[PDB]
Symmetry: C3
Subunit: 33 residues, 3 copies
């Protein structure tokens, strides 16, 4: 059960960092946004 | 403690998928964005 | 291992709530967006 959770949390951490980068770009209007 | 974490992680997975859909729409300019 | 996961999940919950607020603002066009 912990191993299952560890994998899911690591995948969430990747997806959340990606979302943070994308949203910062939208909010700052980077690169033509 | 694991059951508590499992529920929180499942709820996070739902919220992150929702955010990914919303952000893809903003980045792609879907549906009038 | 559970304590490590608990900290990571709490940090994810904070980051996801922040993202939800930011994305709602972008979608609703709040505050000049």
């Amino acid at each position: 059960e912990v191993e299952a959770l560890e994998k899911k949390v690591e995948a969430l951490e990747y997806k959340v960092q990606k979302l943070e980068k994308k949203v910062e770009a939208l909010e700052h209007g980077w690169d033509g946004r």
